Ligand binder design. Structure first.
Ligand SMILES: Cc1ccc(NC(=O)c2cccc(C(C)(C)C#N)c2)cc1Nc1ccc2ncn(C)c(=O)c2c1
Ligand SMILES: Cc1ccc(NC(=O)c2cccc(C(C)(C)C#N)c2)cc1Nc1ccc2ncn(C)c(=O)c2c1
Lengths: 257, 269
């Protein structure tokens, strides 16, 4: 099975921490990442292992195993480099249009696979798209934790309204992908001009606010700008599905190279 | 689970073909490789899916799924680029020592993982080490041949010509009809290390295959370790010699192989 016996993993350097969980770099048949969980977090651990063991895709963080003794741990592959957010907004790594579209294609592949497996990511954003060895996209959920300040920009109008106390779906994931596409094609975050977070939460929820699509770079293909606008629509039933998103991106990638 | 429904995979270009198995490049949530088998190869298919679904490692070919309708199909990730054999021997891709050691380190990681999962590779060679995007090692078994004796308990080197260089002395002897082990896999890895550090295949000066089969089996033949390049680390040459020993019980295990290479890599920076 995927259960890793006690004493096999060599837990190294502490990478990040929050309440509930701590991530480490470790050794287990090469480089690995280990996420340690509190004994209280047993159900959450079981649900996270259950979702991760359903995935075998190049563009999804590779699940490798879990441990139950001495503590609850989730073992994945070690990602090398930084997130797409870091590249676009923290560093100033100026990518060529070819590479931008490739990242978008690799992300659509990962998202399309998840949806086919009946998995909603629930928190798709550039901070959750790892650029492994500066080339391969690895979609994961790297968060550890008003409290959702780092996810509001990618939140669909109905998610912000918490519309049925169950506002998450394949369509809300499509919306977040439209925001990732915005980031890639403009090189910036949406609502950069707006100072208050409560203004964003209120105006997006009401329908009074949407990203400025005139901010896209001059070499942004026409098909990409249309698809981004289709992904960002207010009514979720108007948004496309990922099989259509991916085929549109793949057809665009070949038309460029 | 991992069964892929009919009509999902778009089977594209034919990459390679052999007795029993044909491989294709396809589309299924991005790029994929599809291996179609004959309906008569059902047991082999089940055994191959069974072994592949036990693996989740960066340095092992990523299994993605399978289909049984209209034909038996094994779906894996699509590898980009060429094999380590192609880089070292068919081309002249001249790697720096840093990269050579990294390839060996990534291969020892993959091999160590397999052994921990109680998987003997059975046919490790530079042709089965894919250099994905010219950087990440992906160990798989890319052979489509199936050549041997189906009924032959003791059997043939006229169909195993592409694997004899990596075959341990006891594998060639087929002694006990049970010659495959973790130790025979360690031997093949010693030959991959030879290839990396010399830049050449062992016994390049010997013309007859039957001469190689006879002399290696008898103990009368072993690779010329003076052929290693001048910047080959001392630790690497010793480890290669330890991996290539005639008595299999004298060969090291991969946890140790890995530990020696990893410390060596950091010792080079
Ligand atoms: C160690 C770990 C274990 C589990 C998870 N879990 C997930 O990412 C996840 C959890 C639930 C659901 C999903 C889905 C399937 C929705 C996706 N994608 C993913 C993340 C991690 N974090 C993790 C993994 C690899 C890493 N490599 C390099 N660096 C520098 C890191 O910071 C790092 C962090
Ligand atoms: C499509 C396929 C399905 C299954 C396997 N099977 C194995 O690799 C395998 C079969 C049995 C056992 C093992 C083990 C686990 C021992 C290893 N390693 C591996 C290979 C392939 N071949 C395959 C896979 C990806 C490819 N990408 C690029 N290129 C250009 C190819 O030629 C290609 C070929």
């Amino acid at each position: 099975d995927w259960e890793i016996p006690d004493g096999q993993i060599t837990v190294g350097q502490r990478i990040g921490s929050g309440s509930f969980g701590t991530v480490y770099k470790g050794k287990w048949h090469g480089d690995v990442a280990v996420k340690m969980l509190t004994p209280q977090q047993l159900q959450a651990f079981k649900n996270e292992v259950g979702v991760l063991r359903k995935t075998r895709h190049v563009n999804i963080l590779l699940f490798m195993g879990y441990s139950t003794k001495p503590q609850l741990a989730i073992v994945t592959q070690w990602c090398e480099g930084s997130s797409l957010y870091h590249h676009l907004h923290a560093s100033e790594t100026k990518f060529e249009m070819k590479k931008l579209i490739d990242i978008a294609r690799q992300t659509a592949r990962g998202m399309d696979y998840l949806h086919a497996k009946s998995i909603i990511h629930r928190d798709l954003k550039s901070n959750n798209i790892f650029l492994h060895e500066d080339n391969t996209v690895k979609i994961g959920d790297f968060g550890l934790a008003e409290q959702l300040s780092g996810s509001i920009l990618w939140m669909a109008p109905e998610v912000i309204r918490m519309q049925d106390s169950n506002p998450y779906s394949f369509q809300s994931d499509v919306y977040a992908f439209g925001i990732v596409l915005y980031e890639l094609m403009t090189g910036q975050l949406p609502y950069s001009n707006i100072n208050n977070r409560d203004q964003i939460i209120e105006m997006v929820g009401r329908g009074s606010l949407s990203p400025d699509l005139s901010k896209v770079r001059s070499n942004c293909p026409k098909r990409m700008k249309r698809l981004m606008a289709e992904c960002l629509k207010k009514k979720r039933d108007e948004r496309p599905s990922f099989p259509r998103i991916l085929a549109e991106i793949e057809e665009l990638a070949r038309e460029l190279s």
